[PDB]
């Protein structure tokens, strides 16, 4: 079972799992440790920001790929902002700085 780009989850814009849904594999905690065990940094950022979470990022990467460019635009993980909003829902005041 494989995938290139299909429907994402609603609550968090992440690729679906499983086989019944046309999903993608899980880059789990252990895999992240194994990646950062190397000096591999850009690949991890691509895995967990542009290929899985960043709603605007992945669309732009797709468009660049179709245009022969392999350029990465950082943006920000969507689920990160989701977590920020959720914890702001509690009695917690968290914000971003300069």
């Amino acid at each position: 079972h494989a995938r290139s780009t299909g429907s994402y989850s609603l609550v968090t814009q992440q690729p679906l799992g499983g086989k019944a849904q046309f999903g993608g594999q899980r880059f789990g905690e252990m895999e992240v440790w194994a990646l950062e065990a190397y000096g591999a940094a850009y690949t991890l950022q691509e895995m967990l920001t542009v290929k899985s979470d960043d709603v605007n990022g992945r669309t732009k990467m797709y468009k660049n790929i179709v245009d022969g460019n392999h350029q990465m635009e950082p943006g920000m993980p969507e689920s990160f902002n989701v977590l920020l909003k959720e914890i702001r829902s509690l009695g917690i005041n968290i914000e971003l700085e300069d």
Binding site: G68, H70, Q71
Partner: protein, 72 residues
């Protein structure tokens, strides 16, 4: 390329190798700055690594080329 250990022999850091290779490949991929070494129907990555092996690429040639480009 079987491996890039020779590139490390040329640039012992093993990390700036990746940065310079990616910079050269990005510059020569999107447009302009044609590769200076013959290719083998390979992607920009492989030819950039081969050029780093050949020694014509280093940590200074990219900077001086950018400076000359800036000067014009």
């Amino acid at each position: 390329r079987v491996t890039v250990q020779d590139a490390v022999e040329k640039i012992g850091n093993r990390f700036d190798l990746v940065l310079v290779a990616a910079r050269r490949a990005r510059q020569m991929q999107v447009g302009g700055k044609d590769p200076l070494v013959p290719e083998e129907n390979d992607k920009t990555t492989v030819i950039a690594l081969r050029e780093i092996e050949e020694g014509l690429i280093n940590n200074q040639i990219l900077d001086v080329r950018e400076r000359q480009e800036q000067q014009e």
